[PDB]
Amino acid sequence: EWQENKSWNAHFTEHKSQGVVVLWNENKQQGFTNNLKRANQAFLPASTFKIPNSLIALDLGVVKDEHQVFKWDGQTRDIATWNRDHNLITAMKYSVVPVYQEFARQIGEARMSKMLHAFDYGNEDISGNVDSFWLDGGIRISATEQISFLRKLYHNKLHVSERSQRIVKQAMLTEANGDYIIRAKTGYSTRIEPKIGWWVGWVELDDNVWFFAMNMDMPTSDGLGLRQAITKEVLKQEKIIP
Ligand SMILES: CC(=O)NCCc1cccc(-c2cccc(C(=O)O)c2)c1
């Protein structure tokens, strides 16, 4: 069962923005969104792909564990935090594309393709360059499809080891306090129109979990903070977080 709540559009309108928020209540098995159509429109996953990419790299042994150091290749890039060593935790925290490009190269087209199909991940199409297809290739995923994937991850139901899923869920840790835990991943798609920002993950409460997946128009990097800000305003409105 799905319910459309156009009142959430105000949270996008307030910022001269457009986008979709999709919530899934795990206890009630009920979904909520401001825009049923855009909830089912498929976009490039951009850095939200680091979730499946991490899972595959861990399960194949490309990544030993969350402590393995991936040394900076010495090439100065424009994102300062990319010009340093990383492990899986920090590489996910700072969306370090070059680290995950090497993961994908070592995974390879064939194993990457099989795994995304095993994950039922988006359109499961890796057409393009193996080290950038999630940024400018043929792979696409919708907000509702992000949730279906994330629900499997949360329940350790993806076709990789429990350990791989636990590790990636650790790497997804974004925020935690006495009221909730957020495990999520941001995304920023600029290479193919329309330019969008992603934020997908879930909110762990004492006796329920709310999965979420949002994307929004992102003409400039100046609005990237709106991904979390808008999502949280929706969560506050639905009394999911204080
Ligand atoms: C230098 C600097 O901080 N520029 C402003 C911030 C910026 C510029 C260009 C690309 C990204 C980026 C790249 C991959 C993933 C993500 C994400 O938010 O998931 C974001 C961020």
Side-chain angles (χ1 to χ4, degrees), residues 62-111:
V62 172
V63 173
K64 154 178 66 71
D65 59 29
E66 72 274 23
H67 301 292
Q68 180 175 2
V69 175
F70 313 108
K71 185 177 172 76
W72 178 42
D73 61 5
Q75 303 192 33
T76 304
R77 301 180 174 82
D78 62 350
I79 313 299
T81 182
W82 292 7
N83 301 321
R84 63 180 74 168
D85 300 342
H86 286 283
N87 56 39
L88 192 74
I89 306 298
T90 62
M92 179 148 298
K93 179 182 181 184
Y94 297 105
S95 300
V96 186
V97 176
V99 167
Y100 280 80
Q101 295 183 297
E102 184 59 28
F103 295 172
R105 288 190 283 261
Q106 290 179 33
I107 292 160
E109 283 188 340
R111 292 189 296 184

Side-chain angles (χ1 to χ4, degrees), residues 71-236:
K71 185 177 172 76
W72 178 42
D73 61 5
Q75 303 192 33
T76 304
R77 301 180 174 82
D78 62 350
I79 313 299
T81 182
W82 292 7
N83 301 321
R84 63 180 74 168
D85 300 342
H86 286 283
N87 56 39
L88 192 74
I89 306 298
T90 62
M92 179 148 298
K93 179 182 181 184
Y94 297 105
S95 300
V96 186
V97 176
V99 167
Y100 280 80
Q101 295 183 297
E102 184 59 28
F103 295 172
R105 288 190 283 261
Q106 290 179 33
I107 292 160
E109 283 188 340
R111 292 189 296 184
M112 185 76 77
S113 179
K114 286 190 175 75
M115 285 285 97
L116 295 188
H117 176 66
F119 292 170
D120 196 28
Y121 183 89
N123 69 351
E124 309 175 7
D125 179 5
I126 66 165
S127 87
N129 303 313
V130 70
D131 64 358
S132 71
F133 63 84
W134 64 94
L135 304 174
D136 56 15
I139 193 166
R140 301 286 189 283
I141 190 167
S142 69
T144 60
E145 288 173 342
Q146 294 266 25
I147 291 182
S148 299
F149 170 71
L150 292 164
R151 289 185 62 246
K152 290 192 260 284
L153 176 57
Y154 175 91
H155 292 296
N156 295 332
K157 291 288 184 66
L158 297 171
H159 291 146
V160 288
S161 70
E162 176 180 317
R163 173 179 176 274
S164 294
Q165 292 174 90
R166 286 186 182 281
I167 290 172
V168 172
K169 284 184 282 192
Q170 179 185 350
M172 290 170 56
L173 179 61
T174 302
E175 190 176 1
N177 54 44
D179 296 323
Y180 61 81
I181 300 166
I182 295 174
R183 302 182 187 276
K185 182 73 198 75
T186 58
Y188 185 21
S189 180
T190 64
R191 293 189 174 184
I192 293 182
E193 292 294 302
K195 297 185 184 66
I196 61 152
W198 282 101
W199 199 34
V200 310
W202 60 78
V203 180
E204 305 175 6
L205 310 175
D206 288 343
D207 59 330
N208 201 3
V209 49
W210 283 84
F211 295 84
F212 66 83
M214 77 89 66
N215 59 65
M216 60 178 293
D217 302 343
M218 195 62 59
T220 306
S221 58
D222 297 332
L224 287 173
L226 292 172
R227 300 170 296 179
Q228 295 90 340
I230 291 176
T231 303
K232 282 181 161 180
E233 287 302 311
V234 172
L235 297 169
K236 292 167 179 290

Side-chain angles (χ1 to χ4, degrees), residues 11-22:
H11 300 303
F12 291 98
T13 291
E14 175 181 352
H15 301 289
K16 304 188 290 289
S17 303
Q18 295 164 36
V20 64
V21 176
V22 185

